[PDB]
Write a protein that binds this ligand. Structure first.
Ligand SMILES: O=C(Nc1cnccc1O[C@H]1CCNC1)c1csc(-c2c(F)cccc2F)n1
Length: 270
C-alpha cells in the first residue's frame, strides 16, 4: 500500500505545467508504468468519485480501449496525488518523432491522424473533453504502431454549453478563444486536430502568434496533397460551425483506405 512498496521508481520522463512524471515498474508483475505527481496547491480543477478532476476524467476513459494511456491506480499524499499510468515500451512521443523525421509521409500521417480521431471519439463517448490535443500529448507504441493520448490535466467533462476557461496550449487554441474567451468542446477539438494534422504533414505548427490564428490563412511550407490541404483548411475554419464533425473528417476523401496500426509499424516504424 505504500507507493514505495508496490513500485520501483526509475528516472524522470518530464516535468512542467502538468507536474512531474517518472518511469517505474510494478513490483507484483514487473509491468512497466509511469508515475505522475501533481501538487495539490497546483490543482485548480477538482471533482469527486475528493480528487483532482484529472483522476475523474481518467477513470472515465480508462475502461480498456487502447487509444488512451490508462490510469491503473492512484494515491493521495498530504500535499500531492500520485497517478500510476500505463507505459508502452519502446515508446516515443509524437513531438520527438516528428522532430526526428521531419514532415511525415501522408500514408503515415493518415494512419496516425485516424488513430487520434478514434481516441478523441472514445474520450467524447465517455463524457470527457481532453482540451490539449497536440504532438507532445500523443505517444507512439512503436512495436504495435498504436497511438495513445496522455495528459488529461487540462480536460473537462464534455458538455454542450460554452466553455469560458482554458488552460491547454495556446497555439492549438481556436480563434473564438483568442477573440472572445469562449468555445464549444467539439468544434474547439476539431480546430486543434487541424493544427495537429498540419504539424504532421509539414513538420511544424501553422500559426505562432494570435494574429495569425485569428486571420486563419493557412500557408503550406511543404508539399501536401490537395485533399490533405482541403481537410486541414476545413478543420481550421474560422467560424466554429463551419468546421467538420468527426464523422465528416473520417468520411473525407483524404481519410480513405487507412493502414491498420500493425501494418503501419511494419511499413514505417520497423
Ligand atoms: O501519462 C503519460 N505521460 C504524461 C501524463 N501527463 C502529463 C505529462 C505526461 O508526460 C510527460 C512526460 C513526457 N512528456 C510529458 C505517460 C505514460 S508513459 C509516458 C512516456 C514514456 F513512457 C516515455 C516517454 C515519454 C512519455 F511520455 N508518458
Amino acid at each position: 500500500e505504500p507507493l514505495e512498496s508496490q513500485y520501483q521508481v526509475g528516472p524522470l520522463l518530464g516535468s512542467g505545467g502538468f507536474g512531474s512524471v517518472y518511469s517505474g515498474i510494478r513490483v507484483s508483475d514487473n509491468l512497466p508504468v509511469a508515475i505522475k505527481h501533481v501538487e495539490k496547491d497546483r490543482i485548480s480543477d477538482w471533482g469527486e468519485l475528493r480528487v483532482p478532476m484529472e483522476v475523474v476524467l481518467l477513470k472515465k476513459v480508462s475502461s480498456g480501449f487502447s487509444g488512451v494511456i490508462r490510469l491503473l491506480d492512484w494515491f493521495e499524499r498530504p500535499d500531492s496525488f500520485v497517478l500510476i499510468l500505463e507505459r508502452p515500451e519502446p515508446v516515443q512521443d509524437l513531438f520527438d518523432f516528428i522532430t526526428e523525421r521531419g514532415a511525415l509521409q501522408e500514408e503515415l500521417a493518415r494512419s496516425f491522424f485516424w488513430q487520434v480521431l478514434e481516441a478523441v471519439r472514445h474520450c467524447h463517448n465517455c463524457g470527457v473533453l481532453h482540451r490539449d490535443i497536440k504532438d507532445e500529448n500523443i505517444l507512439i507504441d512503436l512495436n504495435r504502431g498504436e497511438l495513445k493520448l496522455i495528459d488529461f490535466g487540462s480536460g473537462a467533462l464534455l458538455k454542450d454549453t460554452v466553455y469560458t476557461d482554458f488552460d491547454g496550449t495556446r497555439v492549438y487554441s481556436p480563434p473564438e478563444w483568442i477573440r472572445y474567451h469562449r468555445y464549444h468542446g467539439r468544434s474547439a477539438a476539431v480546430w486543434s486536430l487541424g493544427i495537429l494534422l498540419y504539424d504532421m504533414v509539414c513538420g511544424d505548427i501553422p500559426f505562432e502568434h494570435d494574429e495569425e490564428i485569428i486571420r486563419g490563412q493557412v500557408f503550406f511550407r511543404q508539399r501536401v496533397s490537395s485533399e490533405c490541404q482541403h481537410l486541414i483548411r476545413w478543420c481550421l475554419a474560422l467560424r466554429p460551425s463551419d468546421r467538420p464533425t468527426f464523422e465528416e473528417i473520417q468520411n473525407h476523401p483524404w481519410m480513405q483506405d487507412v493502414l491498420l496500426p500493425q501494418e503501419t509499424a511494419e511499413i514505417h516504424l520497423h
